[PDB]
From TrEMBL:
This is Uncharacterized protein. It comes from Synechocystis sp. (strain PCC 6714) (Aphanocapsa sp. (strain PCC 6714)). It comes from the Bacteria. Keywords: Plasmid.
Length: 184
DNA sequence: ACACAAAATATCCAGATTGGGGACACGGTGATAAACATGGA
């Protein structure tokens, strides 16, 4: 019934992106249209999930929160083709209750790692050229839930590029032995 | 009170040796709290 008047308006909710509630100033609602809200019911599936952690004195991998990666699709027709093989070729290495790749230190690690995976699949899946032709921007979100409230830490969105390919190999052979080489 | 003259050649260290032995801390702990947002009749 709501979808009949797709041009009409209705309030948002905390299930989707939050902020259109109190608004931190004035008791005023938000502006939106109905059919846009309906499309936001499936954006979570495409999102990539990474698990961050904080070093303690004993070196235990104290996992806390999650890191979410959101891609900015440029070509809808091309984007829907590469992903079926990208998600089907993930590393199966397991470390305790988490995969090896699921453990990252800084939020930028997860977003940059996604670019490495896509280009390798681009080299495998023909018909695709540069990364920019498929992805325009990458969103990085750090979130954590405590009690009845959810606390945000960092929201970033900056310039995916292709000159960082060597960086992933530079850290695989270097960060394996120590734990403080992440600073460089 | 006048004048004249006020040094010259050789030489200025040679050997042997510059540390040895033992030891470089012991235990106990490495924050604790309070500060909500959406739904159905």
């Amino acid at each position: 019934k709501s979808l009949q008047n797709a041009e009409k308006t209705t309030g948002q909710s905390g299930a989707f992106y939050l902020g259109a509630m109190a608004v931190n100033a004035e008791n005023v609602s938000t502006d939106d249209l109905i059919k846009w809200q309906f499309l936001l019911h499936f954006w979570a599936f495409v999102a990539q999930v990474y698990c961050p952690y904080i070093l303690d004195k004993d070196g235990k991998r104290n996992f806390n929160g999650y890191v979410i990666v959101i891609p900015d699709i440029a070509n809808l027709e091309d984007f829907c083709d590469i992903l079926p093989d990208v998600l089907s070729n993930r590393n199966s290495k397991a470390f305790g209750f988490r995969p090896q790749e699921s453990v990252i230190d800084v939020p930028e690690q997860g977003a940059l790692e996604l670019l490495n995976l896509i280009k390798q699949r681009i080299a495998k899946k023909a018909g695709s050229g540069l990364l920019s032709d498929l992805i325009v921007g990458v969103e990085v979100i750090h979130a954590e839930k405590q009690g009845n409230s959810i606390k945000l830490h960092s929201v970033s969105y900056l310039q995916p590029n292709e000159e960082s390919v060597d960086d992933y190999n530079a850290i695989k052979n270097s960060y394996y032995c120590p734990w403080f080489r992440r600073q460089l």
